């Protein structure tokens, strides 16, 4: 199923996710719906909280043939180093982009879709994508890093878009 993705300024985007107790068929259903939603909207990363599910689940696929599915359940950052930034986007903040400071290289531990643990060292776009997604789970958005003026302007832009989006 394709789930509805929440937009700012929804308060549900600020909720802190609870860890997944046990990776069972219900959780795997959520993971599959999340991938389906992400591809449908053509994103490359999705956090559970963006679809108003407040558990520590993230799906990522940066691939062209939509066939390098990455699932992070209960992710934990073990190490990070360096500093980078690209102009990030987000399906919850339609059509807005901004450069945000991130660590360059990241090492995480997580469970996969089967509930098996794994470690992953990432750099480049993957490292940035994992940080951006891990932020969602503690109620952080990429605009939180920007100046008050920049944040206000982004909110308006999105409110204007959702206002036209429904043409009645
Ligand atoms: Fe996002």
Instruction: Phi first, then psi: give them for residue 92, nearest 5 degrees.
Output: -80, -15
CA pair distance 132, 149, nearest whole angstrom? 21
In the block, tokens 């043939």 appear at: 65
- How many domains is the chain partitioned into structurally? 1
CA 92 to ligand 1 center in whole angstroms = 6
Q: Residue 96: which of 127, 141, 148, 134 has the closest Cα?
A: 141
CA pair distance 20, 81, nearest whole angstrom? 27
CA 24 to ligand 1 center in whole angstroms = 25
How many Cβ atoms sit within 10 Å of the Cβ of residue 28? 15
- The CATH number of the domain holding residue 17 is 3.90.45.10
Q: Which technique was used to obtain these atomic coordinates?
A: X-ray
Question: Residue 91 sits in which domain range?
Answer: 1-168
CA pair distance 123, 50, nearest whole angstrom? 24
Which SS3 state, helix, strand or coil, does residue 121 take? strand
Catalytic-residue membership of 36:
no
CA 153 to ligand 1 center in whole angstroms = 18
CA pair distance 58, 118, nearest whole angstrom? 14
Which SS3 state, helix, strand or coil, does residue 141 take? coil
């Amino acid at each position: 199923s394709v789930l509805q993705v929440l937009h700012i300024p929804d308060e549900r985007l600020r909720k802190v996710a609870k860890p997944v107790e046990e990776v069972n068929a219900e959780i795997q259903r959520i993971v599959d719906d999340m991938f389906e939603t992400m591809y449908a909207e053509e994103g490359i990363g999705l956090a559970a909280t963006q679809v108003d599910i407040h558990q520590r689940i993230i799906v990522i696929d940066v691939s062209e043939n939509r066939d390098e599915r990455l699932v992070l359940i209960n992710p934990e950052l073990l190490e990070k180093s360096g500093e980078t930034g690209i102009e990030e986007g987000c399906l919850s903040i339609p059509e807005q982009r901004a450069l945000v400071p991130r660590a360059e290289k990241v090492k995480i531990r997580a469970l996969d879709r089967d509930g098996k643990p794994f470690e992953l060292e990432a750099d480049g776009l993957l490292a940035i994508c994992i940080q951006h997604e891990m932020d969602h789970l503690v109620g952080k958005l990429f605009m939180d890093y920007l100046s008050p003026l920049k944040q206000q302007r982004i909110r308006q832009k999105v409110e204007k878009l959702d206002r036209l989006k429904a043409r009645a």
